[PDB]
Design a binder for this molecule. Structure first.
Ligand SMILES: *Cc1cc2c(nc3c(=O)[nH]c(=O)nc-3n2C[C@H](O)[C@H](O)[C@H](O)COP(=O)(O)OP(=O)(O)OC[C@H]2O[C@@H](n3cnc4c(N)ncnc43)[C@H](O)[C@@H]2O)c(*)c1C
Ligand SMILES: *[C@@H]1O[C@H](CO)[C@@H](O[C@@H]2O[C@H](CO)[C@@H](O[C@@H]3O[C@H](CO)[C@@H](O)[C@H](O)[C@@H]3O)[C@H](O)[C@H]2NC(C)=O)[C@H](O)[C@H]1NC(C)=O
Ligand SMILES: COc1cc2c(cc1O)-c1cc3ccc(OC)c(O)c3c[n+]1CC2
Ligand SMILES: *[C@@H]1O[C@H](CO)[C@@H](O)[C@H](O)[C@H]1NC(C)=O
Ligand SMILES: [Mg+2]
Length: 495
């Protein structure tokens, strides 16, 4: 019946569930699973997979699915930390957007239309190919899809200069629950606001984003330097880093990846300057001489090269490979946002815990700069002025380490508990692109829960969106009153 509808409407690229271990269905299913944690045979599988090739096919796909009794799941890059683009407790249809990966750059207006199956790397590659003086602000991981990423905000190495990816979206095409094809004018300002950070899988299916391309110099300066130190020095480095990072002028970003193993601590310093190396080094010589950076650490390169380099890719060309395996490990991650400086003992304790679990690592970013100049309600991401750091805790493992899964998860849980007193409180803040089901979830098939959905959902909702939660609920009711687009943490419509 679903197939007959799709055929009648000219949607041809689909595959039904097959039990065949290496069926084509299984190949398409796994192609974009980016967290192996959700790859095993015990996980829910789609009844069919549809690959629309145009906005019309996407529209008609949704229209057909509604005639039936299916849960819709949209997948762009498949990076959901909780696998929410390709799992469901109820029978579901997976709409995989990988064929919608066209990027159209308009050099006369310095904007681009980006189909939502496009990855960040594909976007960055397209931009660098078109111009040596344009770039875009989005995340660090190249295989992340624009569909989920921009829908949730999108923070990266240029966010201190230009804000989130979603802060630079000027139009969009949203396909709603009825298959309507809506641009910014059609969807209205509340819905256009909601889609720019309100979370993927909630408002409808984004077909394409229209973004403003942003100036970059023909040469930027970057460094990627790993310090191998002991805990005393690592603690003093991280404690000073937090001040340097938040306080740097907007033309600079200094971020950290860190981990340890008994007495050996490693800190990878990621630096970016919107300009030349003499200025870059003068700045860090003054503000952070403790890093011990030397001239040879500073590299001048194009913006495109810088984004490939900072992510550890071999070449700019690799940005354009959506199936390049960036990190093939099962993982779980949590995040904190901070409002007060972290005391030295917080870093010391975090490092002690990392030293006991070599499979764990942290990623540290400063806010400030343009992130403090954008109002908390400009887009749904509310963590602007007053927010000092974003701190990510990750534990990751390969298949040969699977028996330690429980131990790994316990470690992460204990790290998050340790950090509680030092980070944001009342509520403990989060980021919707860093979706965390530990906060809870709605079973939309449960009547008593659904009756109280707004209050229940406030637990994660206010963590992700603070005071923007209310407007999100109103936008949800306007664009998806029947809740066609739902998941355990989707914004509830009013009854
Ligand atoms: C795996 C991974 C994730 C990263 C990485 N680095 C990040 C960074 O530097 N900055 C960030 O801000 N975020 C980083 N993240 C997290 C990602 O930002 C999030 O995981 C994104 O949400 C992922 O988006 P995508 O890859 O498209 O993942 P999906 O699982 O397909 O979708 C997520 C979510 O959104 C819905 N959705 C997808 N596509 C659409 C469209 N077109 N319209 C509406 N909704 C859509 C899905 O159904 C799901 O709910 C680094 C790494 C390695
Ligand atoms: C539905 O969509 C999928 C995914 O795009 C289509 O599969 C893709 O088909 C193209 C050909 O049109 C493949 O391109 C070629 O692959 C071969 C190697 O296998 C190579 O010789 C060519 O140079 C080119 O790379 C592509 O590999 C393939 N992608 C995947 C993930 O399978 C499929 O054709 C569509 N199905 C229908 C019925 O339209
Ligand atoms: C499971 O695999 C991975 C998972 C993640 C990351 C890296 C991985 O390898 C990661 C690394 C980051 C490094 C730097 C950075 O800003 C400078 C980030 O925002 C990062 C975000 N993330 C998101 C989670
Ligand atoms: C609905 O949810 C409540 C609270 O989570 C749970 O206790 C109850 O068992 C559920 N009811 C049904 C009918 O599943
Ligand atoms: Mg077989």
């Amino acid at each position: 019946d679903l197939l007959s509808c799709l055929t009648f409407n000219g949607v041809r690229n689909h595959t039904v569930f097959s039990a065949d271990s290496d069926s084509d269905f299984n190949r398409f299913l796994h192609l974009s699973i980016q967290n192996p944690l959700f790859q095993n045979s015990l996980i829910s599988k789609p009844s069919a997979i549809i690959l629309p090739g145009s906005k019309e096919e996407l529209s008609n796909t949704i229209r057909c699915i509604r005639k039936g009794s299916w849960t819709i799941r949209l997948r762009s890059g498949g990076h959901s930390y909780e696998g929410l683009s390709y799992t469901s407790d109820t029978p579901f249809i997976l709409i995989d957007l990988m064929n919608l990966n066209r990027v159209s750059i308009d050099l006369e207006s310095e904007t681009a239309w980006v189909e939502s199956g496009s990855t960040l790397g594909e976007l960055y590659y397209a931009i660098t190919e078109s111009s040596s003086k344009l770039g875009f602000t989005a995340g660090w991981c190249p295989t992340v899809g624009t569909g989920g990423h921009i829908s949730g905000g999108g923070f990266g190495m240029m966010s201190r200069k230009y804000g989130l990816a979603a802060d630079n979206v000027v139009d969009a095409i949203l396909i709603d629950a009825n298959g309507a094809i809506l641009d910014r004018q059609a969807m209205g300002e509340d819905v256009f606001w909601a889609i720019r950070g309100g979370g993927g899988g909630v408002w409808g299916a984004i077909y394409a984003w229209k973004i403003k391309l942003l100036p970059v110099p023909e040469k930027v300066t970057v460094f990627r330097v790993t310090k191998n130190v002991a805990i005393d020095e690592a603690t003093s480095l991280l404690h000073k880093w937090q001040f340097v990072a938040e306080e740097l002028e907007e033309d600079f970003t200094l971020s950290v990846l860190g981990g340890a193993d008994e007495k050996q601590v490693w800190l990878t310093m990621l630096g970016f300057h919107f300009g030349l190396k003499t200025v870059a080094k003068s700045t860090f010589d003054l503000l952070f001489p403790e890093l011990g950076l030397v001239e040879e650490d500073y590299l001048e390169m194009s913006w495109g090269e810088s984004f490939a380099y900072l992510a550890g890719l071999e070449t700019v060309s690799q940005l354009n490979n959506r199936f390049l395996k960036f990190d093939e490990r099962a993982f779980k991650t949590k995040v904190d946002l901070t409002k007060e400086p972290l005391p030295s003992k917080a870093f010391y304790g975090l490092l002690e815990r990392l030293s006991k679990e070599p499979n764990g690592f942290i990623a540290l970013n400063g806010f400030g700069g343009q992130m403090s100049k954008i109002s908390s309600d400009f887009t749904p991401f509310p963590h602007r002025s007053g927010t000092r750091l974003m701190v990510e805790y990750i534990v990751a493992w390969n298949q040969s380490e699977q028996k330690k899964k429980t131990e790994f998860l316990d470690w992460l849980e204990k790290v998050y508990e340790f950090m509680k007193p030092f980070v944001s409180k009342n509520p403990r803040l989060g980021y919707v692109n860093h979706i965390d089901l530990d906060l809870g979830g709605i079973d939309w098939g449960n009547k008593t829960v659904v009756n109280n959905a707004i209050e229940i959902s406030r637990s994660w909702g206010e963590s992700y969106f603070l005071s923007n939660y209310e407007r999100l609920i109103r936008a949800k009711t306007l664009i998806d009153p029947n809740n066609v687009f739902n998941h355990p943490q989707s914004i509830p419509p009013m009854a």
